[PDB]
């Protein structure tokens, strides 16, 4: 009616697919599939922006449903603010030798 | 926008040469065909 | 016919063409006025150093931008569609004439009573008689009775053509295998000219139409003499 013989993804996925599947099982998102959830964005509680290099582009949708996104480079160091709404972001570099 | 000064400035005389060559590149071959249309038409 | 430096339509020879001219005047003013209004705001938006660059609320002004155009379109479409259904109204023709397009000339058949038909070709420029019009005269004109509603049926024996007479507001495509009908009524005697209006090959520019509108009794004797 039924038997086996078909590999599973656990058995046979490879390469990036396998990395994404193993990371997800750990609740981790090294390949940026999910949208990060904002913090309150104050200077004490900045949005923490991970990166593998010294700077990353941020898009800030300052209020819900704005159609305009405000884009800027966030660099390693002191938190920076969105130039439209002032909400704070801080770069958290490093790894993928992760 | 802002930009650096030219790395290889094109002086007025060089612009006149590039502009003349560019216009002749379009005008001479077409001008040659149209000048000779009667030649192509009456055999 | 058209005359040199002409800007608008040929004067109307039929009441339908008159209606089209007034409907065009109505529409063109609107075209004027909108094109002028646009250019004038444009120029108002571009001629002040005052600024306001923060986010602007769109909803109120979009109501005006949709509703006033919609009203303008209804003010064009109402007279437009009155004319369309007027031209389609039943009228009772007194005569039917067919024209067949060919490469490159028209034939005409008037077979209500007798089997009258003939071909109509452009007069070559080197054979024009003095005073005749280059590319527009034909050897055998389409003689027709003035002040009478005539049914013209149009078809083709080869590729598409299109039978047009601008001063009567007429253009009906000539399609092989199809018989298209239009109505013609000239308010005046005279010579009314048109030109083939669908690309049809090497001499598309050189197969014109010339209607000759005369009193019925002259049309009758002409018809008899053409048998």
């Amino acid at each position: 009616a039924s038997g086996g013989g078909v590999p599973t993804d656990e058995e046979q996925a490879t390469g990036l697919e396998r990395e994404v599947m193993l990371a997800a099982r750990k609740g981790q998102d090294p390949y940026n599939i999910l949208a990060p959830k904002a913090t309150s964005g104050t200077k004490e509680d900045p949005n923490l922006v991970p990166s593998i290099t010294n700077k990353r582009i941020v898009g800030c949708i300052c209020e819900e449903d704005n159609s305009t996104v405000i884009w800027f480079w966030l660099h390693k160091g002191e938190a920076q603010r969105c130039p439209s709404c002032g909400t704070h972001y801080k770069l958290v570099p490093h790894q993928l030798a992760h | 926008i802002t930009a650096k000064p030219a790395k290889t400035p094109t002086s007025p005389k060089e612009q006149a040469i590039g502009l003349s060559v560019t216009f002749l590149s379009f005008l001479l071959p077409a001008g040659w065909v149209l000048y000779h249309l009667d030649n192509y038409k009456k055999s | 016919m058209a005359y040199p430096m002409q800007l608008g339509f040929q004067d109307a020879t039929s009441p339908i063409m008159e209606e089209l001219l007034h409907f065009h005047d109505h529409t063109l003013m609107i075209v004027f006025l909108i094109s002028s209004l646009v250019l004038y705001i444009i120029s108002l938006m571009l001629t002040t150093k005052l600024t306001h660059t923060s986010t602007m609320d769109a909803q109120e002004v979009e109501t005006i931008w949709t509703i006033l155009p919609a009203i303008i379109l209804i003010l064009i479409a109402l007279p437009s569609l009155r004319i369309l259904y007027m031209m389609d109204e039943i009228n009772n023709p007194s005569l039917t004439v067919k024209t067949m397009g060919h490469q490159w000339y028209w034939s005409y058949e008037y077979t209500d009573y007798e089997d009258l038909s003939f071909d109509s070709y452009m007069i070559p420029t080197s054979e024009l008689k003095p005073g005749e019009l280059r590319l527009l005269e034909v050897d055998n004109r389409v003689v027709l009775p003035m002040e009478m509603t005539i049914r013209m049926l149009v078809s083709s024996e080869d590729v598409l053509h299109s039978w047009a007479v601008p001063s009567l507001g007429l253009k009906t495509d000539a399609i092989p295998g199809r018989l298209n009908q239009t109505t013609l009524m000239s308010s005046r005697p005279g010579l009314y000219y048109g030109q083939c209006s669908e690309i049809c090959g090497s001499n598309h520019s050189f197969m014109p139409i010339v209607l000759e509108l005369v009193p019925l009794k002259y049309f009758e004797k002409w018809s008899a003499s053409m048998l």
Partner: protein
């Protein structure tokens, strides 16, 4: 939104924040000049005193130039605003763009 007085009072308060930082001074002025208005003297006074707390003389001068610029062809507005600010200009030692020759093309 609010009355004109409430709008003005929110901006006066923004600039009067004692420990306003340089980023906030710039954000405030670059936001304010997006509006359809020339800021009232009392807003400009509070921005000029924020420049003083931030030891930034040049930005005080630039704010006076952007008041003139926002008035467009209404050439009566800037002299009126400089008139109303004269006590604060004298108290803080702020020279106007014209006194500095910075109105010359």
């Amino acid at each position: 939104h609010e009355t004109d007085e409430e709008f003005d009072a929110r901006w006066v308060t923004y600039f009067n924040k004692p420990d306003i930082d340089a980023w906030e001074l710039r954000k405030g002025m670059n936001t304010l000049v997006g509006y359809d208005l020339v800021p009232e003297p009392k807003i400009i006074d509070a921005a000029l005193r924020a420049c003083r707390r931030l030891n930034d003389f040049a930005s005080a001068v630039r704010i006076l130039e952007v008041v003139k610029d926002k008035a467009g062809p209404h050439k009566e507005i800037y002299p009126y605003v400089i008139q109303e600010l004269r006590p604060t200009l004298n108290e803080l030692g702020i020279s106007t763009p014209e006194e500095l020759g910075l109105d010359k093309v």
